Design a binder for this molecule. Sequence first.
Ligand SMILES: NC(=O)c1ccc[n+]([C@@H]2O[C@H](COP(=O)([O-])OP(=O)(O)OC[C@H]3O[C@@H](n4cnc5c(N)ncnc54)[C@H](O)[C@@H]3O)[C@@H](O)[C@H]2O)c1
Ligand SMILES: OC[C@@H](O)[C@@H](O)[C@H](O)[C@H](O)CO
Length: 492
Amino acid sequence: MKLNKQNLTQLAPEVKLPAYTLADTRQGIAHIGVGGFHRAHQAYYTDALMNTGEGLDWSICGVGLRSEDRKARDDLAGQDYLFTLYELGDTDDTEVRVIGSISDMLLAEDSAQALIDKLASPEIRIVSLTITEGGYCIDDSNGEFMAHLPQIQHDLAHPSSPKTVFGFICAALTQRRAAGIPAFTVMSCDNLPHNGAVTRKALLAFAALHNAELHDWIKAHVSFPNAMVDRITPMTSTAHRLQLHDEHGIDDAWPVVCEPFVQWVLEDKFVNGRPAWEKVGVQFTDDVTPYEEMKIGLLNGSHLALTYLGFLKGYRFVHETMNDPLFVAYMRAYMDLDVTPNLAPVPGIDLTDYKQTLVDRFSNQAIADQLERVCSDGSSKFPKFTVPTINRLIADGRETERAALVVAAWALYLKGVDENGVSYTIPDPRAEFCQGLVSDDALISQRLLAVEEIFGTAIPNSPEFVAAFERCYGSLRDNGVTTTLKHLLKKP
Ligand SMILES: NC(=O)c1ccc[n+]([C@@H]2O[C@H](COP(=O)([O-])OP(=O)(O)OC[C@H]3O[C@@H](n4cnc5c(N)ncnc54)[C@H](O)[C@@H]3O)[C@@H](O)[C@H]2O)c1
Ligand SMILES: OC[C@@H](O)[C@@H](O)[C@H](O)[C@H](O)CO
């Protein structure tokens, strides 16, 4: 049965449906970057709220800034913007549900002015973001905005025909301001420590490139709440689409698969209101930092620790790494010895229990999360997920070898051949550049570790870290992943 408004009431009985009248909803959120995570997290909670009969004026208008986004728009439009959220997990606590909280989706390429007009509409009160970990154009080492990027210079030169996220937000804010319409909140839903502060730094820096007056008005009228967001969401696959049809009878052109667990912790800093998400499990706090350091350092950090070694070993799913005891032991040693000592207490959460739940969640066999997905964009992920932990170990004079192995694994992985002799390409926005850094084994540590916007300055200047990196890399190249882990694990 094709999913659409006509067949909504004709689906299998186990399929959960929106409880609200789809036609009564109105838009309040414009979301930039309509991918799997947005649909399985923000759209999911917004749909849940609407099912309680509240927040019907907070429907989401998706926004696609890239040509690849046309396919999402077409697929959703062909189903009256409905899509299936398909939970997969090793227990029965999984549900299949049709989500109705996204009511439209605009593509910048169809008309920049139509998109600016949507973003400047008074009913749109929050502009949310999933533009990836490296989408903010802020150098972690020195905190500066990359003003010299081509697309950034283009937007400064043609402010009414922007291409970038900051260009569209600025154009919309100036148009609202000219019409006497209040600003919206900009709500980052990407995985970065202090993601709201980063969003603010970037937008303000870009605004200052226009003038101080605009930079100052945005600083005083727009809020940028920080948040921790969590829900494992694999890439779309034909197998999952066929499984949804086989098991629940729905023909969905683009369902979103995700794990049952979901979490959202947010600072309540909204200038123009927000849905009452707290009624459906979203947690507001006065300080999200402990939550963000906990989740990014342990979950996202462990994902990088497993993914490159896993890919080299020939594994292709996260659960496969979890079926290898050496990988589980390595992950636990990384979490227990390297990350945990750096964490401040997190209200309402026991870290020992939490670490165990990460092992359980990564061990989900039914979800089939692709190592290609977790591996992707390491150039942007390392400074967010792993380097902060390494810097602390270096400053403390603590053992860096487990953390260095993650970087050594990435370096060998960049050569593009796994242990089964299979050649693969690198899904990274800076693939060519990174691959060139590892072309000469004799110069790898000197060249790879010297990229400041990825590794910072403590790493290349630490003889202890450099030594750990070099021996890990040599060991992986010569003895392979398994033996390297065996040796590392028999280490106090
Ligand atoms: N996938 C997960 O399990 C998960 C979990 C937590 C947080 N996230 C966060 O959300 C992001 C998206 O993951 P996903 O699963 O939706 O991925 P996806 O590949 O399904 O979609 C990524 C979306 O971001 C857009 N995008 C990419 N670069 C952009 C840029 N520079 N400017 C504007 N839009 C851009 C894409 O066009 C697309 O809309 C992550 O990068 C991360 O920060 C993902
Ligand atoms: O909530 C878990 C997500 O942050 C995680 O699946 C990331 O998308 C992953 O670590 C990216 O490599």
